[PDB]
């Protein structure tokens, strides 16, 4: 009666206000109804599904964007008919979803690196840097290279649109370079050649 279905509702804060799910009354009620229906058919003793750890996204007249997070990729699909004037292929991380039957493009998946994977990579870099008191420079740089390509070859198309990840990669790279520099000499160099 007090319209509190919007309080605990989770949506993707990674996207702008007009890009994430719009929390109307009808569609929030529909999403909570869907989650309740799915949770009903699962016995509590056998397993459970938590609303807080779940995300429910709708697409209606009042929601032009469909949101989901699959395998570390945060994707937002936007049909060409909704809010989409025309297609731009200049952006690298936008997938041109194409209707197979009509051989025509109908939607665009806007890819983005999930924040959980961001935090995982940042924690991996922190773990590498912490275990570097006795570690040689070659081993530190090898661990950096391994983690960095494991991240990049996975999110090859999704990093570019993810501006928060670009700033994180540079920060972590500079952090490990500073680690090597301070391993060399205590005082920081004014300029240190990249060679």
């Amino acid at each position: 009666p007090n319209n509190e279905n919007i309080v605990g509702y989770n949506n993707k804060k990674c996207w702008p206000r007009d890009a994430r799910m719009r929390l109307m009354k009808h569609d929030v009620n529909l999403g909570r109804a869907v989650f309740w229906d799915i949770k009903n058919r699962l016995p509590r003793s056998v397993t459970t599904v938590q609303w807080e750890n779940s995300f429910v996204s709708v697409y209606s007249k009042d929601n032009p964007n469909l949101l989901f997070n699959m395998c570390g990729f945060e994707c937002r699909i936007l049909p060409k008919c909704r809010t989409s004037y025309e297609e731009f292929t200049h952006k690298d991380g936008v997938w041109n979803l194409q209707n197979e039957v009509t051989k025509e493009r109908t939607a665009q998946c806007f890819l983005r690196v999930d924040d959980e994977s961001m935090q995982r990579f940042h924690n991996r870099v922190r773990q590498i840097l912490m275990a570097s008191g006795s570690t040689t420079f070659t081993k530190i740089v090898n661990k950096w290279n391994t983690a960095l390509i494991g991240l990049m070859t996975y999110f090859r198309e999704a990093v570019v649109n993810t501006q928060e990840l670009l700033d994180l990669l540079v920060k972590c790279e500079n952090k490990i370079q500073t680690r090597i520099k301070i391993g060399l000499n205590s005082k920081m160099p004014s300029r240190f050649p990249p060679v």
């Binding site: 919007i6 949506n11 804060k13 206000r17 007009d18 994430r20 799910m21 719009r22 929390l23 109307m24 009354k25």
Partner: protein, 194 residues
């Protein structure tokens, strides 16, 4: 070194209370200062789309500027915490300064708009019917008949009323030279154009 202002209407939305409200609202007056966001850094800044925030129900005529949100803070934004209500208005001080001291202190200078007496306009007001019964005693006169209407100190004294604090008071307590900011009233005003 002084300020030509006669009232504090010049500092509308540009005073201490207005700047306190700005800082507490994480908002920047165009000529005012800028501060880091208050303790409510992420209180409701990233509120998502809602049926109450629905832009489809909002009629746009003129954008709600920061000045609107500071002049009427409890109306034009949500969560107005640590917000000070600025002074609404003071009646326009209409003091007319005199350039030539030779002119009389009480004088109808051209700046004042003329008053239409409009005696020819139909207007009837009660009259004593020329009753000769009432005659003033020979020893009664208007008050202060001997004293003149104005002296050479009248215009200067009147001008001292509409003066900044050090010069509008005839006596005070001495202050150390450190405590006197001679330019504090310069940056408190709006920065000149160009």
């Amino acid at each position: 070194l002084l300020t030509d202002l006669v009232d504090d209407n010049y500092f509308y939305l540009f005073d201490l209370k207005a700047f306190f409200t700005s800082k507490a609202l994480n908002m920047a007056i165009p000529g005012g200062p800028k501060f880091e966001p208050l303790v409510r850094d992420i209180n409701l800044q990233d509120e998502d789309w809602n049926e109450f925030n629905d832009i489809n129900k909002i009629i746009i005529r003129q954008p709600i500027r920061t000045e609107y949100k500071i002049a009427f803070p409890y109306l034009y934004n949500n969560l107005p915490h640590h917000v000070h209500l600025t002074w609404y208005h003071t009646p326009n001080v209409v003091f007319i300064k005199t350039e030539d001291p030779d002119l009389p202190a009480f004088y109808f200078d051209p700046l004042i708009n003329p008053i239409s007496h409009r005696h020819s306009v139909k207007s009837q007001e009660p009259l004593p019917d020329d009753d000769e019964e009432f005659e003033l005693p020979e020893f009664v006169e208007p008050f202060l008949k001997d004293t003149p209407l104005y002296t050479d100190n009248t215009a200067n004294g009147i001008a001292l009323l509409w003066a900044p604090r050090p010069f509008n008071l005839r006596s005070g307590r001495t202050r150390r030279a450190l405590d006197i900011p001679l330019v504090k009233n310069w940056y408190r005003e709006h920065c000149p154009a160009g």
